Design a protein around this nucleic acid. Structure first.
Ligand SMILES: [Mg+2]
Lengths: 456, 463, 59, 52
DNA sequence: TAACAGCTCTAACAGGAATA
RNA sequence: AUUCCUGUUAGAGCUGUUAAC
């Protein structure tokens, strides 16, 4: 009776780099082969501008200057590879901004820092960057710096400063990579340098890496939600995301609101069929008009009876819909025996019951570690001693745990904002959550869909 | 016998010539008839929907079965035909067809002597059912004995008849059609295998670097308990506060259900409100605790009470989750020595209850959160090691310490901790262990639960 | 899904490697996959090998 | 979008390869919004004739 | 609609850095 | 907010079972 269904260990997915040289470890592949878009030369040179109070301007220069110099990791050295600088690693020059592009935060912002008005501070920062509206062609990425003195308005009830700033700047179509004191503080320089370098390259327009041998005929939808604490009740903001791969070589990643008022996070028939029809049109626009032969949907909560029918009624017969619910909090947890010195292998999925499986998104990975070669690496050994297996509840897929499990495992590796090996959730879920926060903060975004490079 | 998957493989390898002896299933059978596969289909019931589905698929009528019309159609090779047995004019047709190609029979349990002798007479010839005879039933054990007798008789005769267990006939045909190749667009548009609302994908075989989970199986399929009848309606909150103010030696819930001693019930409830006391037999424990959350809480609390009844370990509660916390007074027992080894750093003795290094009065101890998990139709006891803090509301003040102690409780250390805690909680190692616990053994309404001692585990399938 | 697609080939090979099967184009693989699919049924194995190499696709 | 002014310098230098590379690299602003549009109308001024 | 049980998730803080 | 998600403190939404209105 103590016997369970045979677990199957999904192999670590590969990532595509320059000249289609595959590698599981992203940063090492970036060092050896370079960014995926290097062959296309899509970003070309990267030109970036600043927007910060003058009293901290030099700091930005320093970090940007130190982006152009090699760095050797001291923390998490078991995983991180030696940094070689933007010019060498990304095969792309990093452009020193000129004085015309460089901007200064307008003085009244400092004053409103005393007032504790987040909306006023965000609007004042937008007006400070307004000097860069006309010169959009000159620079590619803006580097807004928020000093620690503004921490009073960084986070407070009902307001998120970075969220508000990005929600205001996204309709203007200019990426920002907000930099706070944290990036400067942080001991291990190579960690932050990998993070900022990858973030800037991807925000310019390049693709640091892509899922190797990814199917272009499958679209992986992901729906998430966020809480707005209304005075009378609650507000649930639900937004969707897509990570499909177009007929070209690059791949797309776009999120959008699901919309007038919702008190529960469960989309009705009308709303769910509307968001799925919008997703279908989005996928059609990229692939000349071809149907998606298989659709994955990752929801944080269970699908309702009406919601499943809404998902079905939006597509034709040829499309295969595998509705999946992802559960992060479970009583189960696994121990690896041969007692293995390292935790259970990442990707080991255990079919518990019909339409219920345990996926170990978190776990040891073989051949990724740099120091002590040939040994497993546990990314989250700092936080947790053992990995926490997530649980998939299937609602619609006709059959096969392998499809959903491998798809999710590969999806947890293409978060460019993340500078570590993987995540806990597929990028669809995390980006839907991020855009849910963005929409919840700013209601006037619901009309338009946005790319991942803006909010990442 | 053979697994349904190998039957599917054999059918798909040679489906151009295989019979069918007898909605989504009927429609896809008509589609297969149109695709010229499985030319000849036999049936017993009226079931005029096969020809209607075929007409919808193709747009032309279906030959439905004269003196020897079936013989004339089969001999002239003018497939496809749909002949109904209606149970000698089919006897010769069935004999010739059995000579030609093999048969798969679904939706039939036998029980009819006419078709039984029909098939038995079809078997005898030199080359009868060359590809094989496949009697498919939703469940092998539920089939009538005559079917198994005929299968054994055919196997003895040298034929390759098999009895495979699959799902419902329509589900079987859907699974078959999802792997048939080179089908025209119109047919796939017509059928599309409808839609699968109640997803149910088979669990693979046990197989043989295994992983050891924390789940302990519960094989107690049913338990006996008591019911009290009230002359007035009650709310669950009133019962809960009555237990809190009285604290009897029994476990109570509303669904009013109880488990313990009758005098405790007479203490909690006066004679006037009590009508009578009877018994309840929850036949399916898993289904009951899945359907009703009150039963879930009641059963988990019953197992908890039975688990620490005779053991020195203390039982606490935190956000409605029960914990087996080690008392300071009994922390020096020899049974904890194994745990002393597991917590120990670099092969030494390890403290399991003490004072946090940087707080005035908080005292820490090792503990395990014990939960009930209803997965599928199985009950699992869920053990999670944890560090408990004596003040319930001051726990966060030891947060750093909690991070400090568990920082290096890696796979080997956590394995040792879990094994030691299982040994402490049950007294035996996970080898051949089905120990029994009982809550309130000296009461009329007691509960005995037999919990598998070995934690749930599975080995990766390999060659 | 076809078989000569690169994505489907990679997905199927990853699935095969998930169950501990041989990795890539290595010895004792062709016979291994034959004996796995056909579970020691030489008649069915022969019929499949006949169908794959039949005298209708040959030019 | 707006082409880089470096395209004019490359065209004056008479380098077709670098001019094509610069025209393609000018497309990143639209590539951040590749879903937005269907067809891109690339215009070339007569001053680039030397590299046509 | 008002309690009760469980499952599950997000909201706000705080917080250290990958076998020691 | 380069990042990761481990904890803590709470609340909500889903289901249920009762009491009704
Ligand atoms: Mg970022």
């Amino acid at each position: 009776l103590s016997q369970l269904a045979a677990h199957s260990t999904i192999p670590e997915p590969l990532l595509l780099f320059k000249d289609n040289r595959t590698d599981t470890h992203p940063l090492r592949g970036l060092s050896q082969y370079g960014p995926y878009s290097a062959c296309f030369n899509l970003p070309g040179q990267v030109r970036l501008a600043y927007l910060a109070p003058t009293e901290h301007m030099r700091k930005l220069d320093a970090i940007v200057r130190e982006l152009q110099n090699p760095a050797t990791p001291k923390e998490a050295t078991n995983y991180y590879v030696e940094y070689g600088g933007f010019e060498k690693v990304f095969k792309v020059p990093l452009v020193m901004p000129q004085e015309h592009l460089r901007c200064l935060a307008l003085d009244e912002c400092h004053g409103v820092a005393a007032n504790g008005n987040g909306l006023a501070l965000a609007d004042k920062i937008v007006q400070s960057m307004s000097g860069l509206f006309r010169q959009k062609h000159a620079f590619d990425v803006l580097l807004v710096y928020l000093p620690a003195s503004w921490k009073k308005c960084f986070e407070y009830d009902g307001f998120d400063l970075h969220d508000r700033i990005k929600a205001k700047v996204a309709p203007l179509n200019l990426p920002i990579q907000i930099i706070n004191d944290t990036a400067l503080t942080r001991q291990c320089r190579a960690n932050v340098m990998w993070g900022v370098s990858v973030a800037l390259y991807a925000k310019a327009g390049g693709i640091p890496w892509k899922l190797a041998d990814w199917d272009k005929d499958e679209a992986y939808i992901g729906l998430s939600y966020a809480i707005k604490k209304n005075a009378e009740g609650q507000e649930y903001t639900t937004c969707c995301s897509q990570v499909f791969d177009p007929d070209g070589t690059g791949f797309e990643f776009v999120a959008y609101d699901t919309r007038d008022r919702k008190g529960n996070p469960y989309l009705s028939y009308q709303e769910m069929q509307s968001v799925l029809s919008k997703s279908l049109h989005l996928y059609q626009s990229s692939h000349n008009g071809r149907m998606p032969r298989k659709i994955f949907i990752h929801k944080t909560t269970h699908f309702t009876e009406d919601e499943i029918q809404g998902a079905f009624d939006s597509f034709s017969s040829s499309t295969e819909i595998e509705l999946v619910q992802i559960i992060q909090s479970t009583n189960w947890y696994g121990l690896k025996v041969d007692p293995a010195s390292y935790p259970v292998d990442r990707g080991l999925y255990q079919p518990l019951t019909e339409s219920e499986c345990l996926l170990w998104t978190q776990g040891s990975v073989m051949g990724v570690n740099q120091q002590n070669p040939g040994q497993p690496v546990f990314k989250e050994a700092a936080l947790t001693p053992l990995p926490n297996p997530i649980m998939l509840r299937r609602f619609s897929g006709n059959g096969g745990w392998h499809a959903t499990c491998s798809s999710i495992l590969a999806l947890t590796k293409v978060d460019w904002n993340n500078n570590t090996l993987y995540k806990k959730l597929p990028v669809t879920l995390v980006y839907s959550q991020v855009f849910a926060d963005v929409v919840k903060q700013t209601p006037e975004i619901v009309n338009e869909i946005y790319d991942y490079r803006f909010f990442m | 016998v053979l697994t349904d998957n190998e039957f599917y493989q054999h059918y798909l390898q040679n489906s151009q010539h295989m019979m069918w002896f007898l909605n989504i299933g009927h429609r896809v059978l008509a589609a297969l008839l149109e695709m010229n596969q499985t030319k000849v289909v036999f049936t017993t019931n009226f079931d005029d929907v096969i020809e209607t589905a075929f007409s919808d698929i193709s747009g032309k009528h279906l030959s439905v079965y004269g003196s020897y019309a079936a013989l004339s159609a089969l001999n002239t090779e003018a497939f496809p035909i749909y002949a109904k047995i209606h149970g000698r004019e089919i006897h010769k047709c069935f004999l010739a067809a059995a000579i030609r190609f093999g048969l798969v029979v679904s939706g039939y349990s036998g029980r009819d002597e006419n078709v039984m002798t029909m098939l038995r007479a079809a078997i005898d010839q030199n080359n009868a059912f060359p590809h094989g005879l496949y009697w498919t039933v939703p469940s092998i054990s539920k089939s009538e004995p005559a079917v198994q007798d005929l299968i054994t008789y055919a196997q003895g005769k040298g034929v390759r008849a098999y009895l495979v267990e699959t799902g419902t006939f329509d589900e079987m045909l859907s699974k078959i059609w999802r792997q048939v190749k080179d089908k025209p667009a119109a047919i796939d548009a017509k059928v599309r295998t409808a839609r699968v609302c109640p997803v149910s994908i088979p669990l693979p075989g046990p197989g043989k670097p295994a992983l050891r989970t924390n789940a302990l199986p519960v094989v107690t399929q049913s338990i006996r308990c008591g019911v009290v009848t009230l002359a007035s309606p009650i709310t669950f909150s009133e019962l809960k506060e009555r237990i809190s103010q009285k604290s009897p030696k029994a476990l109570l819930t509303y669904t009013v259900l109880f488990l313990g001693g009758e005098p405790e019930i007479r203490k909690i409830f006066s004679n006037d409100e009590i009508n009578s006391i009877g018994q309840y037999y929850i036949d399916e424990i898993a289904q009951s605790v899945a359907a009703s959350t009150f039963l879930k809480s009641f059963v988990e609390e019953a197992i908890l009470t039975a688990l620490l009844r005779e053991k020195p370990i203390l039982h606490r509660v935190r956000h409605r989750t029960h914990y087996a916390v080690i008392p300071n007074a009994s922390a020096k027992d020899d049974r904890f020595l194994d745990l002393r080894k597991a917590v120990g750093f670099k092969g030494d003795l390890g403290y399991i209850t003490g004072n946090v290094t940087n707080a005035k009065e908080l005292s820490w101890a090792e503990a395990v959160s014990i939960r009930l998990e209803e997965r599928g139709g199985k009950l699992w006891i869920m053990l999670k090691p944890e560090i408990w803090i004596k003040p319930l509301d001051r726990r966060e003040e030891a947060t750093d310490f909690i991070r400090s102690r568990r920082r290096y409780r890696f796979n080997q250390c956590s394995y040792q901790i879990l094994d030691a805690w299982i040994k402490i909680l049950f007294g035996s190692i996970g080898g051949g262990g089905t120990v029994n616990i009982s809550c309130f053994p000296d009461a009329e309404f007691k509960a005995e639960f037999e919990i598998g001692t070995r934690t749930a585990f599975s080995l990766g399938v390999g060659y | 899904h076809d078989i000569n697609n690169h994505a489907i080939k990679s997905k199927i090979q990853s699935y095969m490697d998930s169950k501990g099967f041989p990795l890539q184009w290595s010895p004792e693989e062709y016979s291994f996959y034959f004996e796995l699919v056909f579970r020691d049924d030489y008649e069915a194995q022969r019929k499949y090998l006949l169908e794959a190499l039949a005298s209708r696709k040959v030019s």
